[PDB]
Design a protein around this ligand. Structure first.
Ligand SMILES: C=C1C(=O)NCCN1C(=O)N1C(c2ccc(OC)cc2OC(C)C)=N[C@@H](c2ccc(Cl)cc2)[C@H]1c1ccc(Cl)cc1
Ligand SMILES: C=C1C(=O)NCCN1C(=O)N1C(c2ccc(OC)cc2OC(C)C)=N[C@@H](c2ccc(Cl)cc2)[C@H]1c1ccc(Cl)cc1
Lengths: 87, 87
């Protein structure tokens, strides 16, 4: 019942998975983003809730990558990937 | 009381802000990451809790960028940056 209009880059992604409209509901945009991710297998094989933005199109939709200092898990994940134990 | 050993890339960042040890406490690594961010001004001017990973060193420490499908705010932020209203 409420339609939105994707900017060109998002429109291209939708069209890449077979959309043909110019305007979409929010549920539609979510469905097609999903489709793009599953069909290109951009999700982690082991933890499928995780999506990699290495794909240029999807990455670009995000804009400059950033994190919040409130994301403690993401920060400690980063730290521990760059540490070793002292024995 | 518990020391960890940064891998070379993290060590370089610490050394870039004046550290000289090879091993650190966790509080120390956090302090120096902080220092790097503030002194290079990688944080958003308007929302200072937000840090951009455009800086190559800091970005690389994170590895391939990813998001979780549980991050609803980050996903809708992305969607709405790529939409306009239909009038
Ligand atoms: C429902 C499913 C779903 O249950 N199965 C796969 C398709 N699928 C799906 O497309 N989605 C999922 C989602 C759930 C579990 C999951 O574990 C493996 C993986 C998911 O799928 C992505 C790995 C492809 N959750 C939705 C969602 C809806 C709204 C919001 Cl703000 C966030 C997420 C949607 C989706 C995913 C990513 C984006 Cl950018 C957009 C939509
Ligand atoms: C305390 C302060 C702090 O209060 N003031 C600035 C220095 N400062 C700081 O260095 N930090 C902050 C932090 C708080 C509010 C804030 O709003 C503007 C900005 C913050 O600072 C970054 C913008 C530079 N919170 C710590 C933290 C500690 C543990 C964890 Cl898992 C997460 C965050 C630490 C910090 C920040 C980023 C990284 Cl990668 C590592 C450490």
């Amino acid at each position: 019942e409420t339609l939105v209009r994707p900017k060109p880059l998002l429109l291209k992604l939708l069209k890449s998975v077979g959309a043909q409209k110019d305007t979409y509901t929010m549920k539609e945009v979510l469905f097609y983003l999903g489709q793009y991710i599953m069909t290109k297998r951009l999700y982690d094989e082991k933890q499928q809730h995780i999506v990699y933005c290495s794909n240029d199109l999807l990455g670009d939709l995000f804009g400059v990558p950033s994190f919040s200092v409130k994301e403690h898990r993401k920060i400690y994940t980063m730290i521990y990937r760059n540490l070793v134990v002292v024995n």
